[PDB]
Amino acid sequence: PVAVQCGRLFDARSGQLKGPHTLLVADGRIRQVLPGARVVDLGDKVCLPGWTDLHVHLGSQSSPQSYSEDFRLDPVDHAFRAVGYAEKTLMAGFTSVRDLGGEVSPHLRDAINQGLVRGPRIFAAGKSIATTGGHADPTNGWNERLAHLVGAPGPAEGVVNSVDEARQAVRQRYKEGSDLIKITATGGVLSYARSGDAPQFTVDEIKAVVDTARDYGFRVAAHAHGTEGMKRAVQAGVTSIEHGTYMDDEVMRLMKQHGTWYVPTFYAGRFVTEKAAIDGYFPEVVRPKAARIGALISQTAAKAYRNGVRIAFGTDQGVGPHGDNAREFVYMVEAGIPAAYALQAATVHAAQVLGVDDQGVLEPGKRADVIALAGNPLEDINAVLDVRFVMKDGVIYKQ
Amino acid sequence: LVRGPRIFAAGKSIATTGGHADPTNGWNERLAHLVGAPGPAEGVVNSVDEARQAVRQRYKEGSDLIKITATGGVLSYARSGDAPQFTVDEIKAVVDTARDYGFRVAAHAHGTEGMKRAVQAGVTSIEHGTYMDDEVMRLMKQ
Amino acid sequence: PVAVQCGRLFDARSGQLKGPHTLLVADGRIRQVLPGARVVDLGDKVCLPGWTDLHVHLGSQSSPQSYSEDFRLDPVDHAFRAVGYAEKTLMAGFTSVRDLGGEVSPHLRDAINQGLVRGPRIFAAGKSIATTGGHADPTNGWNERLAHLVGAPGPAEGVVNSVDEARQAVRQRYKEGSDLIKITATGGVLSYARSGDAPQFTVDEIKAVVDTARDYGFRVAAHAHGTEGMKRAVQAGVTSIEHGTYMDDEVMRLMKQHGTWYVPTFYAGRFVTEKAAIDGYFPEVVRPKAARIGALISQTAAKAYRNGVRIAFGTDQGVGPHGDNAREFVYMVEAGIPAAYALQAATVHAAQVLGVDDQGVLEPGKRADVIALAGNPLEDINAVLDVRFVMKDGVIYKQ
Amino acid sequence: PVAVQCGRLFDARSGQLKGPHTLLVADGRIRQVLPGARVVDLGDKVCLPGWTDLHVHLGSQSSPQSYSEDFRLDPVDHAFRAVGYAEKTLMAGFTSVRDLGGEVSPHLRDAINQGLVRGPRIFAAGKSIATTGGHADPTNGWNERLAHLVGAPGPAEGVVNSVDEARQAVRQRYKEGSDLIKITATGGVLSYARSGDAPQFTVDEIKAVVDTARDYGFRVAAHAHGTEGMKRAVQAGVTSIEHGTYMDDEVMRLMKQHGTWYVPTFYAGRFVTEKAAIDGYFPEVVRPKAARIGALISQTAAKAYRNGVRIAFGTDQGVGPHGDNAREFVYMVEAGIPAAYALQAATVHAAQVLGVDDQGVLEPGKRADVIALAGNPLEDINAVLDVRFVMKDGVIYKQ
Ligand SMILES: N[C@@H](Cc1ccccc1)C(=O)O
Ligand SMILES: N[C@@H](Cc1ccccc1)C(=O)O
Ligand SMILES: N[C@@H](Cc1ccccc1)C(=O)O
Ligand SMILES: N[C@@H](Cc1ccccc1)C(=O)O
Ligand SMILES: [Zn+2]
Ligand SMILES: [Zn+2]
Ligand SMILES: [Zn+2]
Ligand SMILES: [Zn+2]
Ligand SMILES: [Zn+2]
Ligand SMILES: [Zn+2]
Ligand SMILES: [Zn+2]
């Protein structure tokens, strides 16, 4: 039971910044909010709800040695790195994340929930579902010998080629403690494959995935660059679309009429655009796709925002360095999106994307996830780069 | 050889991947890798043809009837307890295959949706009926 | 470039407590000691070299649920616990440990060396070498189905039955990044096997293990309860003997003539004796062995010390809770061993056991592992339970 | 707390029949014997210690359908028969048995010890150790397809071909919960192999088996028909020899000097001789061996007894029907062995063969295994076929 006196409070529901306020917190919930036991004085700081990043990969981080780790490193090394990654993510002001791929994240979520390590609240997708040769196929680029001693990946490994295999893959993800489902509808940039945006799912397979996920209470996120795969994913009924690179007017209309959420991920596009100029950083098959696809996200996201498509906050950290997520906010404001909507997309719209109602706004009966900033972010957007106070579930982690 | 009652045996219970009767729930990655993904011979089905093969495999092993788990359960090492784990097509395939071999089908069900699917497919008995409601009651009576 | 000013200093080379001293720490080494840049002041505290624990298992900790973790838990789950275990071990005053079994410990050592997590300096053995049905056999207690699924373990898994297999197992431990070798010469208490002290190695096999390890520059530690297996291990040429449970005068003469080190591990025996009186804590096949064997270590260690057998500090944490290793000191003093020798066995004798010469004494040119206690340990031993200052390699971790 | 009053008592230590006696049974042991709480009255019956059968196979019983059960029956089907087999064996007067082969018998021993089923006290050997193509090879007679499916058996399956393999096989039998070791030194009758008495072990392999078993505290029993293999087994140091079919003067001298025990098994030879005259009962490869070898046991056992070879009681039930083991007594008497020695071989010599000292004679401080006969066995041996009172460990199972 504590009382946090905030000099200025940001309302995520209305998007407006209020004046001095007091928050009485008990049992990890916001017990009461008073306009105008232990006292926490942040009377010269701007208070906000904890941020949510809807696209992270806490089990990896890009480096020049990435494309060999799968042959040299064990999951235990990735877990030891993920401890520091999760600590840096929590200290940057993000009290919740959605992990969109990786088999160490559910274990890390269990460890954080038990109290062994510090970090955010993780909504884990587990292994991403793909087709043969797809963006998430775990055998792309392997020679004949390794592929022969591995075998052709199947539904247990996340690779499907029919409706029944898609059903089995969704059920296998449920068996392993996943919180949601992730599919790759088209090709990608960082995969060891020729194509970058070709459609890799049929409408029947995506419909089977969505129908199976509805039975287990799972939401489906879709990775899509090309227009045809994005259209198939939207018409099948996925909840969110990732990177939306080649989105057009018909896809925009379908998104608006369906209510699908859009996650642009400015940070990943800028990172892959900058890192493709360095010789030898990416493999020769990856570099042209990175150079071509990275420099379109800002334009596509600005066009989608101007047309009324619902946009939510997500960065794809795992390509960029963990702990620098808030820079995305800056990229959102220099692309023509107002700062208030940018903060709403990380606080109140992120909860709608996640399908929960116990977080997002500083209201009674909700989780006590509170952060504070030195400066007011509605005038200068760089103020989000200096987080002073972090509290999660009523426990103070930075003060 | 021994004393006891007259036994009508069902054998291994048919389930889906991660179901209440899945024999690999809660096993770590190593044991599950040396076991492999259970299939129709092990009682785990994910399609109509797999359900047909599972019913025929139970017949091959001298079963007297068929047992399926339509929803989740309590004592299983799985997260859910009543979520629907069978599609209507799979249960219909199970019942149609069992009718050919003279088998009756018993269904384990806690949640309402799985119970409704099992009843509308044509199972003989429903087990534990935990979240039964008025519509399921009417369907069972009819 | 720091200078630490201690009110009283302990000399591990001689076993006496000196007066005020100043130590100049630069580049991670002890540069120069002065009788009587930045200044650290511990003028009311007693300064000592950092302790070494020669028997730990940082990848496990005994609990009521232990004997099922082999079927329900993954290595990443163990690594997430090992992070906290290592943090507690380092914080308790132990800047160096010798891990005597486990496949996670080398990865934790690499992570600590890279700076990802905090912990002591680890000398890891990796997998322990045993025979078929031995104390360290990873398949003991499994049913026929699982045992057929995995197959009979061989030299790669650490199970040997001949001279060539022992050679290959030593080379396989070298291939996996081990710093030393560990064998189980007899049966044990916590294994799922019927015997507790029967001889499980032949002289030829142990000689082959020692001869192979000598080529690769390793030292061999042997776990031994029974007199025949321990005699075989001593006569083959192992470096240290663990738990010495049924040691007698012929064995004592052999160790005195051979120069073998002895590690009693009071804490493990006391812990198993206490836990054998709780119903259901241990399996039914384990409880009688624990009750019989636990209550003999104290007497055997005292009677070995009275005859002049060289004794080194070890606890077997992993059986007891990590971070409580200093309590072993108390068990050493109440058994008739002077506190000066108890501290020397953990500082200067531990370095001799490890085979290194860059640690153990606070002398110029050696690593700067310095701990400080509030009270004086040479009058009351319980003062070892309150560590106030911990420094390792020149970096302060507690002050 | 019971008192049993017997009209006449047999002294197994001396071989004489005493007069009336009273035995006080408390806590499962014989407490005190009186010449001349609850009272059990057997005043018109002869009291004896419970018998021991040193050669049984409680997991099988010979039948016309035997040589197909390896392909159509599961172990549970055998356990359900073993329940009744053990009940009949205990009810026939045998309170202790030594099982000389089978993977179900250790489980039956555990079940009887836990009290789930009724039966005698079992000393089980587990799998029998043989060489490639040996009498106990579990793959003899299979076609190429099945043999390729299972693969060539190794030490885990009980087949050895070298010293290290024999060591590993002994350790593997120890790992599976065996109480002793069993090897087949020569060929046999009931195996699906060409030979019946050829030497199938080398001296080095048997010496390795014996030396390994001595470390783990086991005794070794060797099945042997031919003189070369039996000589090798005797000179290596086995504890007992089974069936002794082609024993000669040199072998007899070797057993007399070494102190080896001899188990003739009259019943098995008589049964195979009787069943070799029925068409189709045995396979064509088995019938000539049975007809040749069965009709030599009686003569060999009698002529071995005349030379002073120590003889112990054994039948090989599993070949003949369980519960008819006492008939062997008759076969012993008509072959020239006195009834007193026949009873001593089953009571006091059996304990020496087993290596235990808590059974065999009705003396204070020993287990209370007491049987009673209606008639006097020292005048008519057929009285052993009518057992009226059976008690084991102080619990009355028949009265
Ligand atoms: N994960 C994305 C990275 C990316 C995002 C956005 C733009 C460009 C690249 C991919 O590999 O396809
Ligand atoms: N077998 C049932 C047990 C049960 C029956 C009825 C009610 C609750 C539990 C299950 O695990 O689901
Ligand atoms: N590792 C030892 C534990 C132990 C140490 C000392 C005494 C008793 C037990 C064992 O299981 O055998
Ligand atoms: N087990 C013996 C049976 C037997 C015993 C005695 C004489 C003849 C046969 C065998 O098959 O060889
Ligand atoms: Zn993506
Ligand atoms: Zn991604
Ligand atoms: Zn049920
Ligand atoms: Zn040990
Ligand atoms: Zn140990
Ligand atoms: Zn035999
Ligand atoms: Zn036999």
* A238 close to A255: Cβ distance less than 8 angstroms: no
Within chain C, residue ranges assigned H as helices are 69-72, 75-91, 105-114, 144-150, 163-175, 203-215, 227-236, 249-258, 266-275, 287-294, 297-306, 327-333, 339-354
How far does the centroid of ligand 2 lie from the alpha carbon of residue B78, in Å? 13
In this complex, the chains that touch D, judged by 3 or more CB pairs closer than 8 A, are B, C
Q: What is the CA radius of gyration of chain C?
A: 21
* CA separation, residue D277 to residues C198, C377, D69, D274, D320 (Å): 50, 89, 22, 6, 16
What are the chain A neighbours of B18 within 8 Å (beta carbons)? 171-172, 174-175
**Nearest residue in D to C159, CA atom:** D168
What is the C-alpha to C-alpha distance for residues D238 and D244, in angstroms, rounded to an integer? Answer: 13
Name beta bridge partners: C129: C183
What is the C-alpha to C-alpha distance for residues B45 and B54, in angstroms, rounded to an integer? Answer: 7
Q: What are all long-range contacts of D389-392, with beta carbons under 8 Å and residues at least 24 apart?
A: D389/D40, D389/D42, D389/D45, D390/D50, D390/D90, D390/D91, D390/D93, D390/D95, D391/D4, D391/D25, D391/D50, D392/D50, D392/D90, D392/D95, D392/D120, D392/D121, D392/D368
Q: CA nearest C98: which of C118, C126, C61, C123?
A: C123
First and final C-alpha spacing in chain B: 45
Number of helices (H) and strands (E) in chain D: give both, helices first: 13, 15
Give the distance, in angstroms, between the CA of residue C5 and the centroid of all CA atoms in the same chain.
31
What is the C-alpha to C-alpha distance for residues C156 and C150, in angstroms, rounded to an integer? Answer: 13
* C238 close to C206: Cβ distance less than 8 angstroms: yes
Q: How far away is chain C from the Cα of B18, in angstroms, using its nearest Cα? A: 15
State which ligand 4 atom lies nearest to the alpha carbon of D265.
Answer: 6
What is the C-alpha to C-alpha distance for residues C181 and C127, in angstroms, rounded to an integer? Answer: 8
Q: Which residue has the tokens 């003949």?
A: D320
Q: How far away is chain B from the Cα of D246, in angstroms, using its nearest Cα? A: 39
A217: left (phi over 0), alpha (psi -120 to 50) or beta: left
Method: cryo-EM
Name beta bridge partners: D159: D130
What is the C-alpha to C-alpha distance for residues D24 and D46, in angstroms, rounded to an integer? Answer: 17
What is the C-alpha to C-alpha distance for residues A346 and A358, in angstroms, rounded to an integer? Answer: 15
Which distant-in-sequence residues (6+ apart) come within 8 Å of D120 by Cβ?
D86, D89, D90, D94, D95, D96, D97, D112, D392
Q: What are all long-range contacts of A377-381, with beta carbons under 8 Å and residues at least 24 apart?
A: A377/A46, A377/A329, A377/A339, A377/A343, A378/A17, A378/A339, A378/A340, A381/A329, A381/A330, A381/A333, A381/A339, A381/A342
How far does the centroid of ligand 7 lie from the alpha carbon of residue C69, in Å? 27
Tell me the three state secondary structure of residue D48: strand
What is the C-alpha to C-alpha distance for residues A33 and A40, in angstroms, rounded to an integer? Answer: 14
What are the chain C neighbours of D172 within 8 Å (beta carbons)? 132-133, 152
In one-letter notation, the amino acid at residue C104 is V
What is the C-alpha to C-alpha distance for residues D164 and D398, in angstroms, rounded to an integer? Answer: 48
In one-letter notation, the amino acid at residue B74 is V
Give the resolution to one decimal, in Å.
2.5
DSSP class per residue in A309-363 = --B-----BTTBPTT-TTHHHHHHHTTT--HHHHHHHHHHHHHHHHT-SSSSS--
Beta strands in D255-354 (DSSP E): 261-263
Q: How many CB atoms lie within 10 A of CB A13?
A: 12
Tell me the three state secondary structure of residue C120: coil
Chain C interface with D: residues with Cβ < 8 Å: 131-133, 137, 140, 152, 161-162, 165, 193-195, 198-200, 202
CB-ligand 1 contact for A243 (6 Å cutoff): yes
What are the chain A neighbours of C79 within 8 Å (beta carbons)? 76, 79-80
* D350 exposure class (CB count in 10 Å sphere: 0-12, 13-18, 19+): buried
What is the C-alpha to C-alpha distance for residues D24 and D26, in angstroms, rounded to an integer? Answer: 7
What is the C-alpha to C-alpha distance for residues C96 and C393, in angstroms, rounded to an integer? Answer: 11
What is the C-alpha to C-alpha distance for residues D356 and A344, in angstroms, rounded to an integer? Answer: 82
* A359 close to A383: Cβ distance less than 8 angstroms: no
Q: Tokens at residue C154, please?
A: 């061989």
Q: Tokens at residue A130, please?
A: 């793909």
CB-CB under 8 Å, A215 with B16: no
Which distant-in-sequence residues (6+ apart) come within 8 Å of D276 by Cβ?
D282, D287, D290, D291, D294
What is the C-alpha to C-alpha distance for residues C81 and A162, in angstroms, rounded to an integer? Answer: 40
C370: left (phi over 0), alpha (psi -120 to 50) or beta: beta
* CA separation, residue D101 to residues A1, A372, C148, C198, D129 (Å): 70, 76, 20, 24, 9
Q: CA nearest D266: which of D287, D239, D297?
A: D297
Q: How far away is chain B from the Cα of A212, in angstroms, using its nearest Cα? A: 9
Q: How many CB atoms lie within 10 A of CB D201?
A: 26
Q: Which residue has the tokens 């709403």?
A: A344
How far does the centroid of ligand 1 lie from the alpha carbon of residue C391, in Å? 44
Q: Which residue has the tokens 């005493």?
A: D18
* D257 close to D231: Cβ distance less than 8 angstroms: no
Which distant-in-sequence residues (6+ apart) come within 8 Å of A286 by Cβ?
A189, A190, A191, A192
* B45 close to B16: Cβ distance less than 8 angstroms: yes
CB-CB under 8 Å, D215 with C193: no
What are the chain A neighbours of C74 within 8 Å (beta carbons)? 75, 107
Q: Tokens at residue D11, please?
A: 């002294």
The string over A170-196, giving b where at least 16 C-beta atoms fall within 10 Å of a residue's C-beta and e elsewhere, is bbbbbbeebbbbbbbbbbbbbbebebb
First and final C-alpha spacing in chain A: 17
* C152 exposure class (CB count in 10 Å sphere: 0-12, 13-18, 19+): middle
State which ligand 3 atom lies nearest to the alpha carbon of C245.
Answer: 7
What is the C-alpha to C-alpha distance for residues D399 and D391, in angstroms, rounded to an integer? Answer: 8
What is the C-alpha to C-alpha distance for residues C231 and A280, in angstroms, rounded to an integer? Answer: 59
DSSP class per residue in A250-305 = HHHHHHHHHT-EEE--HHHHHHHHHHTSSTTTS-TTTHHHHHHHHTTHHHHHHHHH
Nearest beta carbon to residue B28 from set C72, C149, C150 = C72
- Secondary structure element (H or E) that encloses residue C33, with its range: strand C29-35
* A38 exposure class (CB count in 10 Å sphere: 0-12, 13-18, 19+): exposed
Tell me the three state secondary structure of residue D251: helix
Chain A interface with B: residues with Cβ < 8 Å: 154-156, 164, 167-168, 171-172, 174-175, 177, 215-217
In one-letter notation, the amino acid at residue D23 is L
Q: How many CB atoms lie within 10 A of CB A90?
A: 24
User: What strands lie across the sheet with A240-242, from one edge to the other?
Assistant: A181-184, A220-223, A240-242, A261-263
What backbone phi and psi angles, to 5 degrees, belong to C32?
A: -165, 140
What is the C-alpha to C-alpha distance for residues C370 and C393, in angstroms, rounded to an integer? Answer: 9
What is the C-alpha to C-alpha distance for residues A156 and A134, in angstroms, rounded to an integer? Answer: 16
In one-letter notation, the amino acid at residue B132 is M
Q: Which residue has the tokens 């909504």?
A: A123
CB-CB under 8 Å, A164 with B47: yes
What is the C-alpha to C-alpha distance for residues C67 and A324, in angstroms, rounded to an integer? Answer: 43
How far does the centroid of ligand 7 lie from the alpha carbon of residue B128, in Å? 7
* CA separation, residue C104 to residues A76, A156, C83, C124, C130 (Å): 7, 26, 11, 10, 19
What is the C-alpha to C-alpha distance for residues D370 and D45, in angstroms, rounded to an integer? Answer: 12
